């Protein structure tokens, strides 16, 4: 219902765009915006109205009749209408916690006030507001959206859907379970599809409606502004999960025969990359994937990734704790210990025992560097763990002192073993 409705609205928006009827295009902008505010989608409402401000110039030109919403309808310079809109939009972005966009718009406004219209009161307020946004980015928690890929297959679907795949932007920490419950609500005639693997022409050509849904991972987009610079986790992480057009799906696949003791020796990964028409967030909560690639990760490439990720986690936690000293220590205990004493899952030994024997290296010479990289990662895991454990040592409750005393033990023993074997690294 609401979903399809938004789709129809955007399709007509595009029709009027393509047919260069500006009045109608604008009108539909506002229809779409009202749908968004109905759902409390403040972000997508902002991106929507920006479609309007795109048509306005910073100018003293009297706004045309067509260029104005049928609601407003009074003489205004372009600069004025644009200013008013920018205020509304910045407000929407604020409510949806995209503060980098609010800031970007504020900046434009600020340049007008200072360079063009010379209003220092407004500039003053603007700067104070930017100062609050910049502060907010740092001091306020912005929950990570989950993203989901939905394929729509079968002749039962409209052309704008049929046999395509979209990436959706979920609500805060939203789970596929619920997202898909709702979605299925949108498509009563549809069958829930039981796989994540792309279907054949036997499906795509069937008369009904078959829907595929699975969680995908957002890839950080290349940012020139961040290129060689020392950007702090709290600033860059957001972009890790937001303003994104590239997404990954990873599936485990067993190739070769499984060793029961070591499941990691046999675990290949099938990784699909999706690229959307426009980045998310945007004027809709979903965009169509226009590009798809596949890659296969060997058990070793995967070990390497796992290790990279763990190291990353520990480093990040260390900075997060080093900066804010009010945090609960439980999360640190859990992560650190989980890596220092992986009594259940086995830790990087499962990797050694898998890749460091003579047989493997003899069977895969082309893997030499990777093997070395792995060793390096393990060598690098030690000083990191130690840095975080020292913090743990300062912050830990008395209740947990015996727990910590034992963590340190395991660590010391592990530092000793690993340094002997892979070398020393200091951070």
């Amino acid at each position: 219902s609401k979903d399809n409705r938004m789709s129809c609205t955007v399709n007509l928006l595009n029709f009027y765009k393509d047919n260069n009827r500006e009045e109608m295009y604008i009108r539909y902008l506002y229809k779409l915006r009202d749908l968004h505010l109905d759902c409390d989608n403040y972000t997508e409402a902002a991106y929507t109205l920006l479609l309007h401000t795109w048509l306005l110039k910073w100018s003293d030109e009297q706004c045309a009749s067509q260029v104005m919403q049928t609601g407003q309808q009074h003489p205004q310079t372009h600069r004025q209408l644009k200013e008013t809109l920018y205020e509304t939009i910045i407000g929407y972005f604020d409510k949806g916690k995209m503060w980098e966009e609010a800031i970007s718009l504020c900046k434009e406004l600020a340049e007008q006030y200072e360079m063009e219209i010379f209003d220092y009161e407004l500039l003053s307020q603007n700067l104070i507001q930017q100062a609050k946004f910049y502060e907010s980015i740092m001091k306020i928690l912005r929950p990570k959206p989950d993203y989901f890929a939905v394929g729509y297959y079968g002749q039962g679907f409209p052309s704008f859907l049929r046999n395509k795949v979209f990436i959706y932007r979920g609500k805060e920490y939203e789970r596929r379970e619920d997202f898909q419950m709702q979605l299925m609500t949108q498509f009563p005639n549809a069958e829930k599809m039981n796989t994540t693997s792309a279907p054949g022409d036997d499906v795509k050509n069937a008369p009904g409606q078959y829907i595929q849904c699975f969680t995908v991972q957002p890839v950080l987009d290349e940012h020139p502004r961040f290129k060689n610079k020392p950007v702090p986790d709290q600033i860059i992480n957001f972009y890790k999960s937001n303003y994104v057009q590239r997404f990954h799906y990873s599936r485990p696949v067993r190739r070769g025969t499984v060793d029961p003791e070591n499941e990691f020796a046999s675990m290949w990964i099938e990784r699909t990359s999706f690229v959307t028409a426009y980045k998310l967030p945007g004027i809709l909560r979903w965009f169509e994937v226009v590009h798809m690639s596949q890659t296969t990760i060997s058990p070793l490439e995967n070990a390497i990734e796992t290790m990279s990720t763990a190291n990353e986690k520990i480093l990040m936690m260390i900075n997060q704790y080093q900066s804010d000293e009010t945090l609960p220590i439980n999360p640190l205990s859990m992560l650190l210990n989980g890596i220092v004493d992986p009594a259940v899952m086995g830790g990087f030994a499962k990797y050694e025992k898998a890749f460091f024997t003579e047989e493997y290296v003899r069977d895969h010479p082309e893997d030499q560097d990777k093997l070395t990289h792995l060793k390096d990662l393990i060598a690098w895991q030690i000083p990191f763990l130690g840095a975080g454990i020292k913090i743990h040592e300062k912050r830990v409750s008395d209740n947990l002192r015996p727990f910590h005393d034992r963590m340190e033990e395991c660590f010391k023993n592990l530092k000793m073993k690993v340094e002997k074997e892979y070398g020393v690294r200091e951070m």
Partner: protein, 177 residues
């Protein structure tokens, strides 16, 4: 956001890792990618509220009897786990786990979780169990157990099918708040 410490105990068979990781990664059923390191973390809005759920994976092996409980202090909730297809684990709930947990955390709430639910109706599994003169655990047996050990809730689930899975952790958090 509020942090919650959930310690997960129970025997080897039970498949705790599989459970936790299957949940926290929002994985498609069967498609979870295991790793070599312990525990796991979720962020969720549970009832009206955002929280960070620490899930501590304990080793149920006997060599750790003296070390394991070092994790206990400051725990918000416990998940005691057994396989619905492993009568022995089910017994070790009253035998070992509840005793241990209660010994170190007399105040802290327990949730009793049967696992491998997807296997209770499995003809082959029922067969192997039968050969040993054994039968899988029924819901009322499990509930009986939970009521006995003063477990705040009793739940059944499967990591493979994910039936029942979200609800275990919902119940953990609801038991804390």
């Amino acid at each position: 956001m509020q942090a919650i410490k959930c310690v997960v105990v129970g025997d080897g068979a039970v498949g705790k890792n599989c459970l936790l990781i299957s949940y926290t990664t929002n994985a498609f059923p069967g498609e979870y990618i295991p790793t070599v390191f312990d525990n796991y973390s979720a962020n969720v809005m549970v009832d009206g509220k955002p929280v960070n759920l620490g899930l501590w994976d304990t080793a149920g092996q006997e060599d750790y009897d003296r070390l394991r409980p070092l994790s206990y202090p400051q725990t918000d909730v416990f998940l005691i786990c057994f396989s619905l297809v492993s009568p022995a684990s089910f017994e070790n709930v009253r035998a070992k786990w509840y005793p241990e947990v209660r010994h170190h955390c007399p105040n802290t709430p327990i949730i009793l979780v049967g696992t491998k639910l997807d296997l209770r109706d499995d003809k082959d599994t029922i067969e192997k169990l039968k050969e040993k003169k054994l039968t899988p655990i029924t819901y009322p047996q499990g509930l009986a157990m939970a009521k006995e050990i003063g477990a705040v809730k009793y739940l059944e689930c499967s990591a493979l099918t994910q039936r029942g899975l979200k609800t275990v952790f919902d119940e953990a958090i609801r038991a804390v708040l």
